[PDB]
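Supplementary material to the annual report.
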Amino acid sequence: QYPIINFTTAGATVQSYTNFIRAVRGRLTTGADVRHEIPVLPNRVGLPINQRFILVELSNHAELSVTLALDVTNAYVVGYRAGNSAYFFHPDNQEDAEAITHLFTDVQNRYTFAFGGNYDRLEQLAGNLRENIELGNGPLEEAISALYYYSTGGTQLPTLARSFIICIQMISDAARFQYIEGEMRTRIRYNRRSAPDPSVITLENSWGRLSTAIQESNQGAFASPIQLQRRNGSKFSVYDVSILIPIIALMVYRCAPPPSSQF
Amino acid sequence: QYPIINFTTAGATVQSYTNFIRAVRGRLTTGADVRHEIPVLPNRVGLPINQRFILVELSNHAELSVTLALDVTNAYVVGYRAGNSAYFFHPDNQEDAEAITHLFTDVQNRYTFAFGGNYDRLEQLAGNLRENIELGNGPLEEAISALYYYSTGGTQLPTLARSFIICIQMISDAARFQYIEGEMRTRIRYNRRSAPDPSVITLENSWGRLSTAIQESNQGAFASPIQLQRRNGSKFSVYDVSILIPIIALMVYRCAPPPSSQF
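Predicted assembly:
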């Protein structure tokens, strides 16, 4: 009953991936809430459970499928289903633990991992940092297979963690940032796989802080700058929402918008 | 040979005034230079004399006409012609004095006033502040007649100065600020005459500072806020170009734009 968006790595093109990410954004955010031209995800406070999640059904050339569940309030992957088994990251709190009972409700085998699905924890489990995990259509094809075979013993934990890291960046971070979507489109267009450069990593790491700075800004002006990195690792200072309009596609809700207060 | 734009107070409507101000902006600025969506006037440095001025020919229901000359670099009224006489405000420097010799070149009687055409000086001569000089179609009709009769002794100096104050705000300031154009459209729509409120005056006074703050901003963010006033005289702080996009229509050139420096 939650909305489902389908994507396959089989014969993926720039256009099919673009259509997919556009659909995911459409199901994450409603259009109610736009601050300086940038959409905001729904506020978790008071959000009915029937509106809390979306499902991303991923297929690959190997004819395998898995379904990821994303929380609309922050675009996080909270768990996944493959066949008759579902797995959820360790919940942050009791409300989240209750919420995930509403996902994959007829699956025969439900498991909750003891570990969370944040980047730091997943990198520790993978034995590799994001800067050393290749992304692209081949990585995603492989990730889907690894998730699919987990329940039968074919996938070691570090490979499972790597596979989550790939899915999260190629789906959640691409949905959060047009810039990251653009980086994945380029990989698909040239069928190349490559680890994310510092511009990608620093955006991933800064999403919450950027969301807050934009929402709490004075007419778009940040009280304090945010340091990002360029592709070559050099510093890029962000002082204003304006420079981020081509870059960030949606924000986590961090405060209510101030009154319009137009001149 | 300089471009001429015509306007008449006779049967003026919101649409005829809108057309006029749009034309004036079109002849002031070329489109070369836009910073944060706001056009900039040409830089005075290196600007050829054949591109330096525009002419605004004003007529009224009394069947009188005068021609104002505006400097494209700052939208200032520098002088005017009525029939066989022309009058220029006292030039700021030698280059400006030479420049005005290229205006109204066949007029039989040329005069340069000893006083400048800035608001402070004109208010002193008028014996009234802007806050006590009514604007609207009636004031402008009257101003055109007063300018027209100056050379024949019919217009006292304080009335001449008042008449300049009306023309400058209704033409130059309306061209500089959509907000001020909007205030003059309202006066025309309801055929009411009324002095400018504090929102109008503070914008007029702040045009140079706003131009500089926008041009020198960090991605649109001002280093220091600018205080304006609302219609009721209360303070309104400006921290960013964004809030000014509906308000200011063109800027005086204050610096070269920094490199694009997109992420």
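Chain B is about 35% helix and 20% strand.
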